[PDB]
PDB file of C-alpha atoms in Angstrom:
ATOM      1  CA  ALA A   1      19.274  48.684  32.131  1.00 52.54           C
ATOM      2  CA  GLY A   2      16.025  46.865  32.971  1.00 50.33           C
ATOM      3  CA  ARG A   3      13.798  45.038  30.583  1.00 47.09           C
ATOM      4  CA  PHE A   4      11.056  47.806  30.544  1.00 47.58           C
ATOM      5  CA  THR A   5      13.592  50.583  31.054  1.00 46.73           C
ATOM      6  CA  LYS A   6      15.277  49.624  27.705  1.00 47.02           C
ATOM      7  CA  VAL A   7      11.877  49.436  25.745  1.00 48.88           C
ATOM      8  CA  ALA A   8      10.643  52.740  27.232  1.00 45.29           C
ATOM      9  CA  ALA A   9      14.006  54.358  26.368  1.00 44.74           C
ATOM     10  CA  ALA A  10      14.033  52.988  22.845  1.00 47.57           C
ATOM     11  CA  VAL A  11      10.627  54.517  21.925  1.00 46.87           C
ATOM     12  CA  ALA A  12      10.738  57.812  23.929  1.00 47.66           C
ATOM     13  CA  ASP A  13      11.898  59.967  20.903  1.00 46.73           C
ATOM     14  CA  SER A  14       8.843  58.774  18.927  1.00 45.32           C
ATOM     15  CA  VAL A  15       6.398  60.096  21.644  1.00 45.84           C
ATOM     16  CA  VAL A  16       5.446  63.781  21.723  1.00 44.98           C
ATOM     17  CA  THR A  17       3.551  66.167  23.879  1.00 42.54           C
ATOM     18  CA  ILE A  18       0.517  67.849  22.202  1.00 45.57           C
ATOM     19  CA  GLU A  19      -0.427  71.146  23.738  1.00 45.19           C
ATOM     20  CA  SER A  20      -3.522  73.248  22.889  1.00 44.76           C
ATOM     21  CA  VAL A  21      -3.702  76.779  24.356  1.00 43.74           C
ATOM     22  CA  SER A  22      -6.105  79.636  24.083  1.00 46.37           C
ATOM     23  CA  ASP A  23      -5.761  82.839  26.107  1.00 43.82           C
ATOM     24  CA  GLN A  24      -8.387  81.300  28.583  1.00 45.31           C
ATOM     25  CA  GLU A  25      -7.300  77.556  28.737  1.00 41.61           C
ATOM     26  CA  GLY A  26      -4.505  75.045  28.023  1.00 45.90           C
ATOM     27  CA  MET A  27      -4.660  71.266  27.602  1.00 42.23           C
ATOM     28  CA  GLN A  28      -2.039  68.690  26.987  1.00 40.57           C
ATOM     29  CA  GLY A  29      -1.731  65.089  25.915  1.00 40.82           C
ATOM     30  CA  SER A  30       0.563  62.710  24.180  1.00 42.60           C
ATOM     31  CA  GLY A  31       0.899  61.384  20.681  1.00 46.60           C
ATOM     32  CA  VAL A  32       3.248  59.301  18.521  1.00 46.97           C
ATOM     33  CA  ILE A  33       5.203  60.010  15.398  1.00 49.55           C
ATOM     34  CA  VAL A  34       4.001  57.560  12.778  1.00 52.04           C
ATOM     35  CA  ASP A  35       5.615  58.939   9.499  1.00 52.59           C
ATOM     36  CA  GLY A  36       8.874  60.716   8.742  1.00 52.95           C
ATOM     37  CA  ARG A  37       7.158  63.564   6.905  1.00 55.24           C
ATOM     38  CA  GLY A  38       5.836  64.575  10.391  1.00 56.87           C
ATOM     39  CA  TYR A  39       2.500  62.834  10.733  1.00 56.20           C
ATOM     40  CA  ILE A  40       1.555  62.339  14.363  1.00 58.75           C
ATOM     41  CA  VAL A  41      -1.296  60.161  15.860  1.00 56.76           C
ATOM     42  CA  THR A  42      -3.143  60.934  19.000  1.00 55.66           C
ATOM     43  CA  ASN A  43      -6.639  60.266  20.297  1.00 56.07           C
ATOM     44  CA  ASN A  44      -9.522  62.668  19.347  1.00 58.03           C
ATOM     45  CA  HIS A  45     -10.084  63.736  22.964  1.00 61.90           C
ATOM     46  CA  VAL A  46      -6.614  65.284  23.128  1.00 62.91           C
ATOM     47  CA  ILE A  47      -7.188  67.795  20.352  1.00 67.86           C
ATOM     48  CA  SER A  48     -11.013  68.002  20.428  1.00 68.37           C
ATOM     49  CA  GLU A  49     -11.319  71.451  22.066  1.00 67.86           C
ATOM     50  CA  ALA A  50      -8.846  72.893  19.497  1.00 66.86           C
ATOM     51  CA  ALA A  51     -10.488  71.188  16.504  1.00 68.63           C
ATOM     52  CA  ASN A  52     -13.942  72.560  17.550  1.00 67.68           C
ATOM     53  CA  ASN A  53     -12.635  76.106  18.320  1.00 65.44           C
ATOM     54  CA  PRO A  54      -9.715  76.562  15.925  1.00 68.39           C
ATOM     55  CA  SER A  55      -9.978  80.443  15.938  1.00 70.91           C
ATOM     56  CA  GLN A  56      -8.977  80.589  19.631  1.00 70.16           C
ATOM     57  CA  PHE A  57      -6.649  77.596  20.147  1.00 72.90           C
ATOM     58  CA  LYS A  58      -3.003  77.114  18.995  1.00 74.57           C
ATOM     59  CA  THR A  59      -1.637  73.531  18.869  1.00 73.69           C
ATOM     60  CA  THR A  60       2.050  72.775  19.288  1.00 74.43           C
ATOM     61  CA  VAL A  61       4.062  69.615  19.498  1.00 75.11           C
ATOM     62  CA  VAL A  62       7.003  69.258  21.973  1.00 72.02           C
ATOM     63  CA  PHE A  63       9.702  66.758  21.133  1.00 73.91           C
ATOM     64  CA  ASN A  64      11.783  64.609  23.458  1.00 73.93           C
ATOM     65  CA  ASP A  65      14.718  66.987  22.971  1.00 70.85           C
ATOM     66  CA  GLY A  66      12.431  69.859  24.107  1.00 72.88           C
ATOM     67  CA  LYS A  67      11.941  71.529  20.719  1.00 73.20           C
ATOM     68  CA  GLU A  68       8.457  73.012  20.375  1.00 75.35           C
ATOM     69  CA  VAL A  69       6.951  73.228  16.906  1.00 75.02           C
ATOM     70  CA  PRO A  70       3.562  74.442  15.516  1.00 73.98           C
ATOM     71  CA  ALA A  71       1.289  71.533  14.514  1.00 74.91           C
ATOM     72  CA  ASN A  72      -1.685  71.374  12.077  1.00 75.56           C
ATOM     73  CA  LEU A  73      -4.742  69.093  12.451  1.00 77.99           C
ATOM     74  CA  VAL A  74      -4.784  66.759   9.432  1.00 78.38           C
ATOM     75  CA  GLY A  75      -8.132  65.158  10.306  1.00 81.54           C
ATOM     76  CA  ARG A  76      -9.987  63.366  13.202  1.00 82.53           C
ATOM     77  CA  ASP A  77     -12.522  60.665  13.780  1.00 82.65           C
ATOM     78  CA  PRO A  78     -14.568  60.995  16.964  1.00 82.53           C
ATOM     79  CA  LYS A  79     -16.067  57.541  16.262  1.00 82.38           C
ATOM     80  CA  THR A  80     -12.694  55.767  16.661  1.00 80.46           C
ATOM     81  CA  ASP A  81     -11.361  58.483  19.056  1.00 79.97           C
ATOM     82  CA  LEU A  82      -8.343  59.094  16.692  1.00 80.14           C
ATOM     83  CA  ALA A  83      -6.776  62.236  15.205  1.00 81.88           C
ATOM     84  CA  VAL A  84      -3.726  62.925  13.023  1.00 84.67           C
ATOM     85  CA  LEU A  85      -1.463  66.038  13.255  1.00 85.90           C
ATOM     86  CA  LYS A  86       1.272  67.245  10.956  1.00 87.74           C
ATOM     87  CA  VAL A  87       4.522  69.071  11.755  1.00 86.99           C
ATOM     88  CA  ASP A  88       6.299  70.608   8.739  1.00 89.65           C
ATOM     89  CA  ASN A  89       9.872  70.333   7.674  1.00 89.60           C
ATOM     90  CA  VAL A  90      11.274  68.819  10.924  1.00 89.70           C
ATOM     91  CA  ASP A  91      14.259  66.631  10.152  1.00 88.19           C
ATOM     92  CA  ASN A  92      15.614  63.342  11.527  1.00 87.52           C
ATOM     93  CA  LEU A  93      12.233  62.297  13.119  1.00 91.55           C
ATOM     94  CA  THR A  94      12.349  59.115  15.090  1.00 90.80           C
ATOM     95  CA  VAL A  95       9.341  57.369  13.587  1.00 96.28           C
ATOM     96  CA  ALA A  96       7.524  54.793  15.733  1.00 95.08           C
ATOM     97  CA  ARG A  97       7.569  51.155  14.460  1.00 96.72           C
ATOM     98  CA  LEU A  98       3.968  49.988  14.098  1.00100.67           C
ATOM     99  CA  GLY A  99       3.209  46.398  15.230  1.00100.34           C
ATOM    100  CA  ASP A 100       0.408  44.162  14.219  1.00101.60           C
ATOM    101  CA  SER A 101      -2.472  44.122  16.770  1.00101.97           C
ATOM    102  CA  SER A 102      -3.858  40.836  15.300  1.00 99.57           C
ATOM    103  CA  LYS A 103      -0.850  39.061  16.650  1.00101.83           C
ATOM    104  CA  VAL A 104      -1.292  40.418  20.195  1.00105.11           C
ATOM    105  CA  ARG A 105      -2.291  37.819  22.856  1.00108.22           C
ATOM    106  CA  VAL A 106      -3.749  37.983  26.284  1.00107.28           C
ATOM    107  CA  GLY A 107      -1.090  38.061  28.961  1.00105.46           C
ATOM    108  CA  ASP A 108       1.468  39.858  26.627  1.00105.45           C
ATOM    109  CA  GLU A 109       3.466  42.406  28.622  1.00104.78           C
ATOM    110  CA  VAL A 110       3.009  46.002  27.561  1.00102.01           C
ATOM    111  CA  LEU A 111       4.044  49.563  28.303  1.00102.24           C
ATOM    112  CA  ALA A 112       1.572  52.462  28.138  1.00104.58           C
ATOM    113  CA  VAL A 113       3.996  55.223  27.293  1.00105.96           C
ATOM    114  CA  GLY A 114       3.267  58.930  27.788  1.00108.54           C
ATOM    115  CA  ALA A 115       5.388  61.716  26.377  1.00109.15           C
ATOM    116  CA  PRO A 116       8.516  62.180  28.491  1.00107.98           C
ATOM    117  CA  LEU A 117       8.231  66.038  28.876  1.00109.83           C
ATOM    118  CA  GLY A 118       4.450  66.319  29.436  1.00110.80           C
ATOM    119  CA  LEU A 119       3.565  67.963  32.766  1.00112.11           C
ATOM    120  CA  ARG A 120       1.766  64.911  34.212  1.00108.31           C
ATOM    121  CA  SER A 121       3.556  62.324  32.057  1.00108.75           C
ATOM    122  CA  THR A 122       3.452  58.620  32.984  1.00107.30           C
ATOM    123  CA  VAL A 123       4.840  55.340  31.845  1.00107.65           C
ATOM    124  CA  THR A 124       2.966  52.301  33.108  1.00109.11           C
ATOM    125  CA  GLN A 125       3.348  48.576  32.706  1.00110.71           C
ATOM    126  CA  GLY A 126       0.969  45.688  32.625  1.00111.15           C
ATOM    127  CA  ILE A 127      -0.394  42.941  30.426  1.00113.02           C
ATOM    128  CA  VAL A 128      -2.988  42.690  27.836  1.00111.67           C
ATOM    129  CA  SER A 129      -6.171  41.653  29.682  1.00110.59           C
ATOM    130  CA  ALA A 130      -8.589  41.286  26.787  1.00110.23           C
ATOM    131  CA  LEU A 131      -8.889  41.684  23.014  1.00108.47           C
ATOM    132  CA  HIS A 132     -11.666  42.970  20.804  1.00110.13           C
ATOM    133  CA  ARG A 133     -13.339  44.528  23.801  1.00109.76           C
ATOM    134  CA  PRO A 134     -16.091  47.100  23.029  1.00110.88           C
ATOM    135  CA  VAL A 135     -15.813  49.979  25.363  1.00110.85           C
ATOM    136  CA  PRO A 136     -17.904  53.202  25.545  1.00108.43           C
ATOM    137  CA  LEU A 137     -16.016  56.563  25.481  1.00108.19           C
ATOM    138  CA  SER A 138     -17.615  59.825  26.324  1.00111.09           C
ATOM    139  CA  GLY A 139     -17.053  62.572  23.661  1.00108.13           C
ATOM    140  CA  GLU A 140     -14.885  65.447  25.012  1.00111.37           C
ATOM    141  CA  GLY A 141     -16.216  68.671  23.471  1.00111.04           C
ATOM    142  CA  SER A 142     -19.504  68.705  21.613  1.00110.98           C
ATOM    143  CA  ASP A 143     -18.065  65.410  20.288  1.00109.52           C
ATOM    144  CA  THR A 144     -20.439  62.425  19.992  1.00106.18           C
ATOM    145  CA  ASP A 145     -19.897  59.574  22.518  1.00106.60           C
ATOM    146  CA  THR A 146     -18.760  56.410  20.808  1.00107.94           C
ATOM    147  CA  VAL A 147     -17.721  52.785  21.324  1.00102.50           C
ATOM    148  CA  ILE A 148     -14.460  51.159  20.099  1.00102.98           C
ATOM    149  CA  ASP A 149     -13.246  47.703  19.859  1.00102.97           C
ATOM    150  CA  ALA A 150     -10.304  47.996  22.229  1.00 98.55           C
ATOM    151  CA  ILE A 151      -7.357  46.316  23.578  1.00 96.65           C
ATOM    152  CA  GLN A 152      -7.829  46.153  27.349  1.00 95.71           C
ATOM    153  CA  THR A 153      -4.764  46.312  29.593  1.00 96.73           C
ATOM    154  CA  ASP A 154      -4.166  46.447  33.350  1.00100.03           C
ATOM    155  CA  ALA A 155      -1.495  49.026  32.574  1.00100.92           C
ATOM    156  CA  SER A 156      -2.820  52.262  34.033  1.00101.41           C
ATOM    157  CA  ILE A 157      -4.055  54.657  31.370  1.00104.18           C
ATOM    158  CA  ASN A 158      -4.386  58.249  32.737  1.00105.82           C
ATOM    159  CA  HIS A 159      -3.938  61.888  31.730  1.00106.66           C
ATOM    160  CA  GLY A 160      -0.136  61.411  31.679  1.00108.53           C
ATOM    161  CA  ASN A 161      -0.105  58.694  28.843  1.00111.54           C
ATOM    162  CA  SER A 162      -3.379  59.081  27.020  1.00111.99           C
ATOM    163  CA  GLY A 163      -2.826  59.623  23.330  1.00112.28           C
ATOM    164  CA  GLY A 164       0.555  57.886  23.629  1.00109.94           C
ATOM    165  CA  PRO A 165       1.312  54.440  22.323  1.00107.50           C
ATOM    166  CA  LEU A 166       0.744  51.055  23.868  1.00106.89           C
ATOM    167  CA  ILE A 167       4.115  49.344  23.274  1.00106.92           C
ATOM    168  CA  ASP A 168       4.928  45.648  23.135  1.00106.38           C
ATOM    169  CA  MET A 169       8.096  44.017  24.325  1.00104.87           C
ATOM    170  CA  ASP A 170       9.580  44.371  20.785  1.00106.80           C
ATOM    171  CA  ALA A 171       9.213  48.132  21.266  1.00105.90           C
ATOM    172  CA  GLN A 172       6.595  48.316  18.556  1.00106.90           C
ATOM    173  CA  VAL A 173       3.191  50.223  18.737  1.00109.77           C
ATOM    174  CA  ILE A 174       0.237  47.914  19.209  1.00111.08           C
ATOM    175  CA  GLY A 175      -2.225  50.613  20.027  1.00113.73           C
ATOM    176  CA  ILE A 176      -3.034  54.202  21.015  1.00114.35           C
ATOM    177  CA  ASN A 177      -3.914  54.851  24.738  1.00115.72           C
ATOM    178  CA  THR A 178      -7.444  56.234  25.106  1.00115.78           C
ATOM    179  CA  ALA A 179      -8.444  59.164  27.385  1.00115.76           C
ATOM    180  CA  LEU A 180      -8.906  48.767  33.537  1.00115.76           C
ATOM    181  CA  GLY A 181      -7.165  50.817  30.665  1.00116.31           C
ATOM    182  CA  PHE A 182      -8.054  50.696  26.940  1.00114.64           C
ATOM    183  CA  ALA A 183      -6.066  51.228  23.651  1.00116.76           C
ATOM    184  CA  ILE A 184      -7.344  51.650  20.175  1.00116.85           C
ATOM    185  CA  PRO A 185      -5.685  48.689  18.329  1.00116.28           C
ATOM    186  CA  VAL A 186      -2.890  49.593  15.916  1.00112.10           C
ATOM    187  CA  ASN A 187      -4.399  47.837  12.841  1.00112.64           C
ATOM    188  CA  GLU A 188      -7.550  50.032  13.159  1.00109.68           C
ATOM    189  CA  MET A 189      -5.310  53.146  13.863  1.00109.97           C
ATOM    190  CA  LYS A 190      -3.424  52.462  10.573  1.00112.78           C
ATOM    191  CA  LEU A 191      -6.640  52.200   8.526  1.00111.28           C
ATOM    192  CA  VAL A 192      -8.167  55.356  10.094  1.00116.10           C
ATOM    193  CA  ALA A 193      -4.918  57.392   9.910  1.00113.57           C
ATOM    194  CA  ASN A 194      -4.409  56.510   6.272  1.00114.40           C
ATOM    195  CA  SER A 195      -7.903  57.832   5.596  1.00113.51           C
ATOM    196  CA  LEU A 196      -7.538  61.030   7.586  1.00115.09           C
ATOM    197  CA  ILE A 197      -4.262  61.830   5.835  1.00112.51           C
ATOM    198  CA  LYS A 198      -5.683  61.508   2.328  1.00113.30           C
ATOM    199  CA  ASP A 199      -9.196  62.773   2.815  1.00113.23           C
ATOM    200  CA  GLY A 200      -9.067  64.680   6.111  1.00113.32           C
ATOM    201  CA  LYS A 201     -12.198  62.557   6.990  1.00113.66           C
ATOM    202  CA  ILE A 202     -13.318  58.959   7.549  1.00112.92           C
ATOM    203  CA  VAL A 203     -16.797  57.736   6.421  1.00113.79           C
ATOM    204  CA  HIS A 204     -18.423  55.067   8.631  1.00114.61           C
ATOM    205  CA  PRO A 205     -21.567  53.077   7.959  1.00114.45           C
ATOM    206  CA  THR A 206     -24.843  54.026   9.737  1.00116.17           C
ATOM    207  CA  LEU A 207     -28.203  52.305  10.104  1.00114.97           C
ATOM    208  CA  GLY A 208     -30.221  55.003  12.055  1.00112.32           C
ATOM    209  CA  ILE A 209     -30.647  52.947  15.281  1.00111.71           C
ATOM    210  CA  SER A 210     -30.108  53.752  18.895  1.00109.55           C
ATOM    211  CA  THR A 211     -30.176  50.763  21.294  1.00108.99           C
ATOM    212  CA  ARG A 212     -30.204  49.958  25.000  1.00108.40           C
ATOM    213  CA  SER A 213     -28.570  46.691  26.342  1.00106.45           C
ATOM    214  CA  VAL A 214     -30.908  43.889  27.513  1.00106.54           C
ATOM    215  CA  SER A 215     -29.808  40.623  29.278  1.00106.11           C
ATOM    216  CA  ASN A 216     -32.344  37.855  30.162  1.00104.75           C
ATOM    217  CA  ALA A 217     -33.333  34.220  29.342  1.00102.71           C
ATOM    218  CA  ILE A 218     -35.709  35.180  26.402  1.00 99.21           C
ATOM    219  CA  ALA A 219     -33.143  37.175  24.295  1.00101.18           C
ATOM    220  CA  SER A 220     -30.019  39.109  25.300  1.00 97.15           C
ATOM    221  CA  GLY A 221     -28.570  41.868  23.087  1.00 98.18           C
ATOM    222  CA  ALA A 222     -29.266  45.384  22.014  1.00101.95           C
ATOM    223  CA  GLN A 223     -32.881  46.469  22.288  1.00 99.27           C
ATOM    224  CA  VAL A 224     -33.909  49.050  19.738  1.00 97.87           C
ATOM    225  CA  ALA A 225     -34.765  52.340  21.521  1.00 96.16           C
ATOM    226  CA  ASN A 226     -35.225  54.588  18.434  1.00 93.43           C
ATOM    227  CA  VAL A 227     -35.286  54.164  14.642  1.00 92.39           C
ATOM    228  CA  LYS A 228     -34.635  57.349  12.499  1.00 93.97           C
ATOM    229  CA  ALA A 229     -37.187  58.215   9.845  1.00 94.80           C
ATOM    230  CA  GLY A 230     -35.940  57.340   6.351  1.00 93.90           C
ATOM    231  CA  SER A 231     -33.062  55.351   7.766  1.00 90.65           C
ATOM    232  CA  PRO A 232     -31.677  52.019   6.446  1.00 91.25           C
ATOM    233  CA  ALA A 233     -33.186  50.379   9.438  1.00 97.82           C
ATOM    234  CA  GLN A 234     -36.582  51.914   8.893  1.00 99.88           C
ATOM    235  CA  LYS A 235     -36.486  50.909   5.284  1.00100.70           C
ATOM    236  CA  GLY A 236     -35.332  47.395   6.222  1.00102.94           C
ATOM    237  CA  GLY A 237     -38.194  46.811   8.638  1.00101.24           C
ATOM    238  CA  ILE A 238     -36.536  47.138  12.076  1.00102.57           C
ATOM    239  CA  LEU A 239     -38.986  47.976  14.821  1.00101.26           C
ATOM    240  CA  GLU A 240     -38.683  49.529  18.250  1.00101.30           C
ATOM    241  CA  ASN A 241     -38.446  46.996  21.083  1.00103.52           C
ATOM    242  CA  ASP A 242     -36.707  44.634  18.592  1.00 98.76           C
ATOM    243  CA  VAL A 243     -33.698  42.953  20.313  1.00101.17           C
ATOM    244  CA  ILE A 244     -30.744  42.854  17.959  1.00102.91           C
ATOM    245  CA  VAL A 245     -28.618  39.755  18.417  1.00102.47           C
ATOM    246  CA  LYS A 246     -26.510  39.726  15.223  1.00104.41           C
ATOM    247  CA  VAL A 247     -25.267  42.435  12.860  1.00104.35           C
ATOM    248  CA  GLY A 248     -23.643  41.168   9.689  1.00104.56           C
ATOM    249  CA  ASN A 249     -21.227  38.450  10.638  1.00103.97           C
ATOM    250  CA  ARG A 250     -20.940  39.622  14.273  1.00103.31           C
ATOM    251  CA  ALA A 251     -23.005  38.426  17.232  1.00101.00           C
ATOM    252  CA  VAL A 252     -24.019  41.342  19.441  1.00103.54           C
ATOM    253  CA  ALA A 253     -24.026  40.907  23.215  1.00105.46           C
ATOM    254  CA  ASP A 254     -25.212  44.380  24.081  1.00107.34           C
ATOM    255  CA  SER A 255     -25.630  48.053  22.960  1.00108.04           C
ATOM    256  CA  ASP A 256     -21.803  48.535  23.058  1.00108.85           C
ATOM    257  CA  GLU A 257     -21.059  45.700  20.659  1.00113.87           C
ATOM    258  CA  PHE A 258     -23.940  46.814  18.487  1.00112.93           C
ATOM    259  CA  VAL A 259     -22.166  50.135  17.928  1.00114.52           C
ATOM    260  CA  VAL A 260     -18.942  48.510  16.984  1.00110.94           C
ATOM    261  CA  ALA A 261     -20.601  45.865  14.825  1.00112.28           C
ATOM    262  CA  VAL A 262     -22.454  48.407  12.703  1.00113.90           C
ATOM    263  CA  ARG A 263     -19.097  50.071  11.867  1.00111.47           C
ATOM    264  CA  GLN A 264     -17.804  46.770  10.337  1.00112.04           C
ATOM    265  CA  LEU A 265     -20.581  46.768   7.711  1.00111.37           C
ATOM    266  CA  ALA A 266     -20.049  47.716   4.094  1.00107.19           C
ATOM    267  CA  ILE A 267     -21.675  50.997   3.012  1.00106.32           C
ATOM    268  CA  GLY A 268     -24.292  50.475   0.302  1.00103.68           C
ATOM    269  CA  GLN A 269     -24.327  46.618   0.520  1.00103.15           C
ATOM    270  CA  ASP A 270     -27.198  44.524   1.779  1.00104.21           C
ATOM    271  CA  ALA A 271     -26.589  42.827   5.155  1.00105.41           C
ATOM    272  CA  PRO A 272     -28.490  40.605   7.573  1.00104.08           C
ATOM    273  CA  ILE A 273     -29.683  41.847  10.994  1.00104.13           C
ATOM    274  CA  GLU A 274     -30.964  39.136  13.346  1.00103.34           C
ATOM    275  CA  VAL A 275     -33.646  40.316  15.751  1.00105.90           C
ATOM    276  CA  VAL A 276     -35.866  38.807  18.408  1.00105.08           C
ATOM    277  CA  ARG A 277     -39.366  40.285  18.099  1.00107.08           C
ATOM    278  CA  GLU A 278     -42.281  39.336  20.305  1.00110.73           C
ATOM    279  CA  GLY A 279     -40.507  36.002  21.177  1.00109.69           C
ATOM    280  CA  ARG A 280     -39.835  35.180  17.530  1.00107.87           C
ATOM    281  CA  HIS A 281     -36.484  35.197  15.746  1.00110.67           C
ATOM    282  CA  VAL A 282     -36.505  37.410  12.554  1.00109.62           C
ATOM    283  CA  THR A 283     -33.803  38.197  10.089  1.00110.54           C
ATOM    284  CA  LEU A 284     -34.123  41.524   8.258  1.00109.02           C
ATOM    285  CA  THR A 285     -31.966  43.090   5.524  1.00106.30           C
ATOM    286  CA  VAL A 286     -30.389  46.548   5.753  1.00107.00           C
ATOM    287  CA  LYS A 287     -28.290  48.523   3.309  1.00105.47           C
ATOM    288  CA  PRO A 288     -26.062  50.782   5.429  1.00101.73           C
ATOM    289  CA  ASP A 289     -25.803  54.504   4.477  1.00100.30           C
ATOM    290  CA  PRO A 290     -22.514  56.485   4.741  1.00 98.38           C
ATOM    291  CA  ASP A 291     -22.624  58.764   7.819  1.00 97.88           C
ATOM    292  CA  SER A 292     -21.037  61.537   5.608  1.00 97.38           C
ATOM    293  CA  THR A 293     -22.715  61.327   2.166  1.00 95.77           C
ATOM    294  CA  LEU A 294     -20.590  64.013   0.415  1.00 96.61           C
ATOM    295  CA  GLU A 295     -17.272  62.477   1.406  1.00 93.69           C
ATOM    296  CA  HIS A 296     -18.422  59.042   0.202  1.00 89.70           C
TER     297      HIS A 296
END
């Protein structure tokens, strides 16, 4: 058996098909078993339509052996494009082994593994092409668009392996394939999954700013398109046409990195925003709000 053949074969039983059907429509993706009690991780696109219209969709999980079981949505985070499902009282689950995405390096060989029985299923191979790479993702349903800090790979990521794991050569999960490919890194997945399992929700920081990217000799970064009334940004003295170049401890190259950087701030704690305003460099202070005040 070949090098990749062995790794794909070792993790196949941890990968599942997730199917959502209404009497009008029927969509399908992959996901990975992450906990022996039957917790399954996928991306938020895969279950979005069912989560938004639960009265008309039924979600099932199909195992490598072909068993089909009903699945319940535990919680989801459109901002990180992740979701968690739960199957009840299924025995002898092959739980995926979760790696450490902070140890992943550019050039590392990977498999992007889709669920073996999915209709369009794919397994692809490549390397890690970049780390900590902000990438915009369009929201599936009425879901908000977002940006994630991704693992980039030249393994093809397509309908047939999205929601499945990105697997390293130790056959460990180093990320979740999104919907020139990108994976949500496993260290972030673990933090978001933990939260969705407990609370059924994740609370992210918000400033009330929308930005557009600017690149030139005077100041490159995320130029402020809009500031929400009453927002942390309004209260902290951020102005439209300000060019944001640093948010907290993270330099901000463009509007994509701005989105990711905000989400690394502490809720309720003062933080520096560096701005270029009418040719001058200004540091403001902002106290981020929770995006969901009642779950904070």
